[PDB]
Design a protein around this ligand. Structure first.
Ligand SMILES: *[C@@H]1O[C@H](CO[C@@H]2O[C@@H](C)[C@@H](O)[C@@H](O)[C@@H]2O)[C@@H](O[C@@H]2O[C@H](CO)[C@@H](O[C@@H]3O[C@H](CO[C@H]4O[C@H](CO)[C@@H](O)[C@H](O)[C@@H]4O[C@@H]4O[C@H](CO)[C@@H](O[C@@H]5O[C@H](CO)[C@H](O)[C@H](O)[C@H]5O)[C@H](O)[C@H]4NC(C)=O)[C@@H](O)[C@H](O[C@H]4O[C@H](CO)[C@@H](O)[C@H](O)[C@@H]4O[C@@H]4O[C@H](CO)[C@@H](O)[C@H](O)[C@H]4NC(C)=O)[C@@H]3O)[C@H](O)[C@H]2NC(C)=O)[C@H](O)[C@H]1NC(C)=O
Ligand SMILES: *[C@@H]1O[C@H](CO[C@@H]2O[C@@H](C)[C@@H](O)[C@@H](O)[C@@H]2O)[C@@H](O[C@@H]2O[C@H](CO)[C@@H](O[C@@H]3O[C@H](CO[C@H]4O[C@H](CO)[C@@H](O)[C@H](O)[C@@H]4O[C@@H]4O[C@H](CO)[C@@H](O)[C@H](O)[C@H]4NC(C)=O)[C@@H](O)[C@H](O[C@H]4O[C@H](CO)[C@@H](O)[C@H](O)[C@@H]4O[C@@H]4O[C@H](CO)[C@@H](O)[C@H](O)[C@H]4NC(C)=O)[C@@H]3O)[C@H](O)[C@H]2NC(C)=O)[C@H](O)[C@H]1NC(C)=O
Ligand code: CL
Lengths: 213, 171, 211
């Protein structure tokens, strides 16, 4: 493990969902890799919009297969602060470095935009099969932080994948979520729902339904 | 009256990085009776009485004016030293040149850490490339050699650069 | 890992491999070449076997003062699709040993895509523009091309997701064509064109218009 350039820092956003519901705790995450065994000590300083804060929580070191430590510090953010646009600075200091590394993360900048949520039934051509595809189109949203889930008759449906967001011609984003179910279930008349959570929705939530006729 | 001593730098570079060794060497004539040399750093008297003064591992606090004086000299005109922080520093014997002078730039790295894929920039345009670190020479300076200058490369897998510096060319 | 030129090796475009009217190529790109050591020799290997038909351009200096040099090898459509391996060995005064890089189509049982066009949702017909969707699922490998077209002209204003790894090891994607609501109401006919190795003649289209 040679490590000529010393540690490197990567800084992560909270999960889209944790920012959008008060029940949940959104966190920013500072990860230092390539810490040598020779100079293991790492010190964090954290700043919100330039002011130093003191409430972050550093984990103990972790030996890795490549024989370097990984060191992680976690700062809990306020829901309002993340959404109000505040700048989170992680500053990291190690003797292998000529100067600390500073990384900054914030929510994306720009006028927010309400997602439009359209659900779509299977193509007729799909009714041939034993499984059909229930589709949820979510478009015209900004920023790209969003959560999309599916459920039926109250319970969450397990067999679905949502594509990541895609940047559309007008600066907004869109995605698709495909829910796969049995042909019987869909014809049996069951009610399915596409749950969307996003900062621009009244009450951070909207829910569109889908079923046969 | 009596000639003034002078401060000599070894190595010669007026700009250095933290941790760089630098030796300040006082040159004047001593008396038979008095073997000492007094050293000032800005307004402060340095306690060491040595012929030459060692900054073994430079810090930003070592920055400033240095003067010396020897038992049979006046006090030296001051010599300037700027300790910079970072990975890379563009060093040069000076920054103004006459047409025809030689220019010797050095892309000095913190603790001499091995640097590769090194490029010397002029005015935001890569000018000269080396696979391993090397000094860059323009033996005959000219009007076109005027501009802003930086160097960069890789330290292992990490990407680094020097602060930029202006070079002027006179008549 | 400690300083000298550097090699990048690029696969042909999926379309060039799938359509017999086109010519796929592999492309071997060498950058960070000194002026002081500037001659660059490439050796090329198909499934271990040296070949001699590569076309290699003379070197071009970049903004950054380094030299760049490209070698291009034409591929047989079937060699690519059958999973043959392509190896570019690069050599230079400045290199301790030659650098070799290898590419191949991705490995695995190919699966045919199912292609389904889906019309705009009921609610979207409020808006002055609507979304025609094209779902493509059950396909392996991920290499694919998806276009849209109406009345012979191609349609410009669509976006297609990355492939997404689906739960059965196949991939799926969606492509969203946007059109003025008026065009949809008038009864115009739009097509999702799809190219993929596991389709018959590497091509299929489903169409979509109002009822
Ligand atoms: C000095 O200058 C030169 C010139 O730079 C260029 O000009 C200047 C002004 C700058 O603007 C600069 O930005 C320009 O690029 C510098 O040369 C560059 O050097 C860097 C490395 O430092 C190269 O970086 C790699 O790039 C790969 C992507 O390359 C393509 O995409 C970029 C931009 O997106 C383009 O600019 C390139 O041209 C490449 O574009 C492709 O070119 C193909 C060949 O033409 C095209 O395919 C062909 O197309 C034709 C017809 O069009 C047919 O279709 C043919 O059949 C077909 O073959 C293709 O269309 C085209 N695509 C485009 C434009 O989209 C990255 O892939 C690569 O990333 C990998 O490796 C990195 C290691 O450095 C690492 O960071 C990554 O993590 C990743 O590592 C890999 O990880 C994956 C995981 O998925 C693993 O699977 C891999 O195994 C693993 N390793 C490897 C080795 O793969 C690099 O980032 C850059 O490409 C190169 N540019 C050029 C133009 O050559 C030079 O660096 C400068 N140097 C200095 C010191 O100053
Ligand atoms: C020695 O070992 C350690 C440990 O490695 C681990 O274990 C070994 C044994 C191997 O198995 C490894 O495969 C394995 O990773 C190595 O540490 C790794 O070092 C690399 C770089 O050298 C880091 O790469 C960065 O990765 C981030 C994304 O990382 C997330 O996703 C990973 C999988 O995709 C996952 O492994 C990571 O843990 C991390 O996971 C996230 O964790 C957060 C916080 O916990 C969590 O809340 C998230 O939910 C979770 N997400 C997921 C999906 O799991 C990537 O973003 C970085 O890319 C940026 O930087 C590149 C250059 O550094 C650059 O090319 C890219 O363009 C990109 O640059 C960014 O681009 C965006 C827009 O694209 C721009 O806006 C940004 O500003 C810009 N940023 C920068 C800085 O330029 C980067 O690829 C690994 O994350 C890191 N892994 C771990 C686990 O710590 C170490 O490298 C090894 N050292 C040596 C010498 O070999
Ligand atoms: Cl070989």
């Amino acid at each position: 493990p040679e490590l000529l350039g010393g540690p490197s820092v990567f800084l992560f956003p909270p999960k889209p969902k944790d920012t959008l519901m008060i029940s949940r705790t959104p966190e920013v995450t500072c990860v230092v890799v390539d810490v040598s065994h020779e100079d293991p000590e790492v010190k964090f300083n954290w700043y919100v919009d330039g002011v130093e804060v003191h409430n972050a929580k550093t984990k103990p070191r972790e030996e890795q297969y490549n024989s370097t430590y990984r060191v992680v510090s976690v700062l809990t953010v306020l829901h309002q602060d993340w959404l109000n646009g505040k700048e989170y600075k992680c500053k990291v200091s190690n003797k292998a470095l000529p100067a600390p590394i500073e990384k900054t993360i914030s929510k994306a900048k720009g006028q927010p935009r309400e997602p439009q949520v359209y659900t779509l039934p299977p193509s007729r051509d799909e009714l041939t099969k034993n499984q059909v595809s229930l589709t949820c189109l979510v478009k015209g949203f900004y920023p790209s932080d969003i959560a999309v889930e599916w459920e039926s008759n109250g319970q969450p449906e397990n067999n679905y994948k949502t594509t990541p967001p895609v940047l559309d011609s007008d600066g907004s984003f869109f995605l698709y979520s495909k829910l796969t179910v049995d042909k019987s279930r869909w014809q049996q008349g069951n009610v399915f729902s596409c749950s969307v959570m996003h900062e621009a929705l009244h009450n951070h939530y909207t829910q569109k339904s889908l079923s046969l006729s | 009256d009596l000639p003034k001593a002078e401060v000599i730098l070894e190595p010669q570079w007026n700009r250095v990085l933290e941790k760089d060794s630098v030796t300040l060497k006082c040159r004047g004539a001593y008396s038979p009776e008095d073997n000492s040399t007094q050293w000032f750093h800005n307004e402060s008297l340095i306690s060491s009485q040595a012929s030459s003064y060692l900054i073994d591992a430079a810090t930003v606090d070592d920055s400033g004016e240095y003067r010396c004086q020897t038992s049979l000299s006046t006090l030296s005109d001051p010599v300037q030293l700027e300790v910079h922080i970072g990975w890379l520093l563009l060093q040069a014997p000076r920054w103004e040149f006459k047409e025809g002078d030689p220019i010797h730039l050095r892309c000095h790295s913190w603790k001499n850490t091995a640097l590769h894929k090194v490029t010397y920039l002029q005015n935001g345009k890569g000018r000269k490339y080396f696979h391993h670190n090397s000094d860059f020479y323009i033996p005959k300076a000219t009007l076109k050699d005027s501009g802003s200058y930086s160097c960069r490369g890789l330290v292992g897998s990490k990407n680094v650069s020097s602060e930029t510096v202006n070079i002027t060319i006179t008549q």
